[PDB]
């Protein structure tokens, strides 16, 4: 409860209080919303326009003298029209292009041919904008699958005599995720020797591959693997300092585009200090089995205890100094 | 049959057994499927909704007293309606906007004007979502052409006195492929000196261009060209060790976007150890001919024997040590 930056499942929880301004725009926002407001909002829209043209033909029909029923000395402006419902149903007939055909309009009433054409045009407009945007909706939504996943908790070790800090990623679908990189940040309280304090100053830790490099290749699960070295800004912290008091939630960003969509998307998590723990290690996840490779995620984060040096990485930089 | 990671044509064959969960979502999946399930699934959908509103107008018509045929003392809720088929055909008339016009509705039966408007709205919804998604289908599918291709088998040599490991890519269409990079990984059994074993630990081999660099420019076929050096993690293996027992399938990833689509896509292959072979070399593929350049892929992988040092690249790092 102490400090929260992003969540275990990884949503950014930090909010914003009263910037100097709502983000003036029209259809950017509807698509980002949830279903009920988009569906409801449109059917309400149709009901709006429908109502409108309903009543306009109600009136123009009415005041044209043909609406009050009679016999002879007249031609209808719309056939067999009578009262509220009549006009309503006929306008709604034209919008989505029904056309029972029982009701009918003639060329007699010029303002009527007017009002008809204007209705059809603007109605086709609302049709267009609607279908186009909801298209853009099923592109991506709040349901955009974060198929990439990440551990309940994380550890460190010394690989090749050198301290290292893990994480696990993961895939909730069998389908292909491609062009996948990694960028990962650290948040901590920070102050200048010249005395200018900032809330948090994001500083990089490179994910150590070969040839530097931003990213790794995910279909099979593969561990993420990197440096703690006294040149790298994360070298200082102590094992028994961080696990209790020292404030860390390490944030990690992966950015990719799910193979079939052709649109970018991402997924997120951090790690609370008390969560990130010392000197344990990941079990082998995958195994070669049957006639294939075999993968069991039931063990995804399972952990072992390893005889690895318990010391402060500042005193393994003092070990890196001494031995 | 021993070890399989991705295929000769390059599909990833490795599967996943029982992750902790199907990837809860709605329309992400349909598009990734194949044709029969999408086409069939929609026409079945239309049949669903159609059936529904069919029967609803069946009933409301029925219990309204006008469905049982009579003469006088009535107005129809829908004209000339009689039995199952009648209502069926008329509802289906309204959905996709037919409107024979022979059958007709009046304003008499308020619940009828209700049921009509609600039908038209939701029906236009299914129309929308459908057309939009299948749009997204012909964007890309499982038929997405892997036009990039790659050799039946691969070799090595010493270029400029330095060992090197090839591959060939390729293009099955005359059209343009642009913004094309390369990322390539190696899978092998790996263990720490500190004794933590992983199933496979992906490690990089950079494709050696000029100025490092991730990618090369494909219209004309161009060989891929790189390092084996004792600093590079692939330096150790022996010629006569790998070709039989030593486990390698070198995986190679290319990620691009076919010029006209504006969406990313990729293609994949690996190479089985016994497949990757020693001391052969690629024939010249292209030739200058007629009034143009000329390219024959019938030779695409054709191969020659070259007098190049037979030794272990660890003993050509011991040669790199000695001479």
């Amino acid at each position: 409860r102490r400090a929260r930056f992003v969540s275990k499942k990884g949503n950014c929880n930090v909010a914003h209080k009263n910037i100097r301004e709502f983000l003036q725009d029209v259809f950017t926002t509807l698509v980002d919303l949830k279903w009920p407001h988009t569906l409801l909002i449109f059917t309400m829209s149709f009901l709006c326009s429908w109502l409108l043209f309903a009543m306009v033909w109600w009136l123009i029909a009415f005041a044209h003298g043909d609406l009050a029923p009679g016999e002879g000395t007249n031609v209808p402006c719309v056939t067999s029209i009578h009262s509220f419902s009549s006009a309503f149903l006929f306008s709604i007939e034209v919008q989505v292009t029904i056309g029972f055909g029982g009701r009918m309009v003639t060329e007699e009433c010029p303002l009527a041919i007017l009002i008809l054409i204007v209705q059809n045009i603007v109605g086709l407009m609302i049709n267009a904008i609607m279908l186009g945007c909801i298209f853009m909706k099923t592109a991506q939504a709040h349901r955009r699958a974060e198929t990439l996943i990440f551990s309940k908790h994380a550890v460190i070790t010394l690989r090749h005599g050198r301290l290292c800090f893990m994480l696990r990623v993961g895939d909730l679908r069998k389908s292909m995720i491609i062009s996948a990189t990694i960028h990962m940040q650290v948040v901590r309280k920070t102050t200048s020797p010249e005395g200018e304090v900032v809330p948090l100053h994001q500083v990089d830790i490179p994910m150590e591959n070969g040839v530097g490099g931003n990213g790794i290749f995910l279909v099979a699960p593969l561990i993420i693997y990197h440096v703690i070295d006294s040149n790298s800004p994360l070298y200082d912290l102590a094992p028994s300092d961080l696990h209790h008091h020292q404030d860390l939630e390490i944030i990690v960003i992966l950015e990719g585009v799910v193979e079939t969509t052709g649109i970018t998307t991402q997924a997120r998590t951090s790690y609370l200090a008390d969560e990130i723990l010392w000197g344990q290690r990941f079990v082998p996840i995958v195994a070669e089995e049957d006639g294939r490779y075999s993968v069991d995620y039931s063990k995804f984060g399972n952990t072992i205890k390893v005889p690895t040096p318990l010391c402060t990485a500042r005193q393994l930089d003092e070990d890196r100094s001494l031995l | 049959r021993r070890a399989r990671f991705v295929s000769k044509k390059g599909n990833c064959n490795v599967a996943h057994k029982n992750i902790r969960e199907f990837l809860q979502d709605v329309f992400t999946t349909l598009v990734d499927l194949k044709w029969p399930h999408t086409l069939l699934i929609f026409t079945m959908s239309f049949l669903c909704s159609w059936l529904l509103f069919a029967m609803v107008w069946w009933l409301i018509a029925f219990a309204h007293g006008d469905l049982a045929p009579g003469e006088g003392t009535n107005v129809p809720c829908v004209t000339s309606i009689h039995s199952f088929s009648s209502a069926f055909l008329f509802s289906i008339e309204v959905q996709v906007t037919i409107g024979f016009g022979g059958r007709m509705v009046t304003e008499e039966c308020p619940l009828a004007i209700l049921i009509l408007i609600v039908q038209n709205i939701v029906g236009l919804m299914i129309n929308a979502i459908m057309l939009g998604c299948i749009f997204m289908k012909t964007a890309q599918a499982h038929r997405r052409a892997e036009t990039l291709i790659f050799s039946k088998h691969a070799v090595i040599t010493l270029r400029h006195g330095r060992l090197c490991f090839m591959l060939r890519v390729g293009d099955l269409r005359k059209s343009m492929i642009i913004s094309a990079t390369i990322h390539m990984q190696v899978v092998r059994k790996t263990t720490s000196p500190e004794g933590e074993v992983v199933p496979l630990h992906q490690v990089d081999i950079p494709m050696e261009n000029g100025v490092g660099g991730n990618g090369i420019f494909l219209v004309a076929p161009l060989i891929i060209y790189h390092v084996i050096d004792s600093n590079s993690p692939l330096y150790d293996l022996a010629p006569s060790d790998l070709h039989h027992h030593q486990d390698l399938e070198i995986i190679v990833i290319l990620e691009g976007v076919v010029e006209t689509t504006g969406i990313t896509t990729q293609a994949r292959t690996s190479y089985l150890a016994d497949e990757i072979l020693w001391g052969q070399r690629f024939v010249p593929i292209v030739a200058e001919e007629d009034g143009r350049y000329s390219v024959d892929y019938s030779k695409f992988g054709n191969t020659i024997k070259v007098p190049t040092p037979l030794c272990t690249a660890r003993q050509l790092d011991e040669d790199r040590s000695l001479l």
Binding site: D296, S298 | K17, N18, I19, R20, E21, F22, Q24, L30, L33, H37, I41, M44, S45, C48, S49, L51, L52, M55, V56, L59, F62, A63
Partner: protein
Amino acid sequence: FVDALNVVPHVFLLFITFPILFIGWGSSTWLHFPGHNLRWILTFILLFVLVCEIAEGILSDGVTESRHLHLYMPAGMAFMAAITSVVYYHNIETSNFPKLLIALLIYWTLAFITKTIKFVKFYDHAIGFSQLRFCLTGLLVILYGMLLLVEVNVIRVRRYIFFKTPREVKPPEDLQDLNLLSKGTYWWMNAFIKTAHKKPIDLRAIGKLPIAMRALTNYQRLCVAFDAQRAIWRALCHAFGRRLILSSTFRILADLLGFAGPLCIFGIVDHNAYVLAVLLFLALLLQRTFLQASYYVAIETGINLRGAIQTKIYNKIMHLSTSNLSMGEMTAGQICNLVAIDTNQLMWFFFLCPNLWAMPVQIIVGVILLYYILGVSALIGAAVIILLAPVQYFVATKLSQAQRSTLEHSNERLKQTNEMLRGMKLLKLYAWESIFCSRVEVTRRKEMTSLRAFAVYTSISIFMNTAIPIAAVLITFVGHVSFFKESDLSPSVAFASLSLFHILVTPLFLLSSVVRSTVKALVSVKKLSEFLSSAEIRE
């Protein structure tokens, strides 16, 4: 107003309507959601209801003029619908994620209740003919709706109270081997039997039994409940008694309707034909399945029982005093045969033990249930059918001494064979290769005698079996011809007596084996407690 009857169809047909789209569009962690098996059984009986309705329809349609009536279909649509209803329950719960699908199911279950109400205004006439099955479906469908309510009453699917989904994890399945209704008919072994033949099976293909099947926890509870309490039977059957009785009562529901064949034979034996036919079909299905799954309950309980029995065996054996090796080899061979022999004895007896409980309840109901109380052609032939009891059990009375006899002979033949066969180059250089027949045929002589005669006493018994049924019916049947009710011969009583003769014939021979099982079981208790009293080592 028949708009009611047809007005029932709308809700259900819609319930299929949305569902077919969802499941079709859907085109591996198994689990168990809320109360499940209850809803499974309620579903099954429900299907029985709906199919019965087609009988009332099939009655009403024929009498009516101008072909089939509109009302006859509505039932049909329903019985089609609920079927799939269970299925969406299957692709939902088994897929977990019970957010929307559960909701929708709640919707369908609700919109039923209105149709039930339509029966409630149809209530003006109380005969029941269609009414009984109908309002019967009122109570049924309603109680089901309460079941879905319970589904809210465990996991709490809906948006209420923002409790999300408490207590969510899978049962302990990782290696495992390699639902109720499908499970009962053994649908789960299809992969095992196909991939079985894919390549002949290996110990790698089979893998550890689950926890609840694991011998450890087996001996665990056995040992605590036992320690919570000489003569152990009280303790053992008071340990596994739950699964024991559970097997029992289900076995008696399977057995009691074992009579299903006979009564149906009487009914169609009358000439309401088709209805009786189909009802008989569903009958046979229920009966057969139930009986087999009964066998499952039995043997299964067996696997657990014997398995832990071993745990007690060595568990006490080692922790006991070693000075009893003063008994030594006798405990070696004999006390070995306690586990090896006496175990299989024990678990066999437990396995058939519910058949022991219920076996008479089936029998006496067997004789008594025979139509034909008034004429004395019943208790006579059927009194032969009971008279075959001492035939079998006495066939044992001559069987045992035969078996242990071939046992004594086999010791000699086997011992002499093992003795002459080893160094045969040494007996060849000694140049005999002759009196081996005196070592064999003379050994075979008794071994040809005690064996041969035994087989005779063995085979004759089985012969009497094939003699009893054919003679029992016929003579009994023929007896009626001469004796009483001479006026009319009816086909009903005839083929009826055939079927009841077959089914009733089974349990008699079964018991004739069962007695030996109870006896050997007792002796097993004796030597078992004998192992209990053995010398304990001080720790």
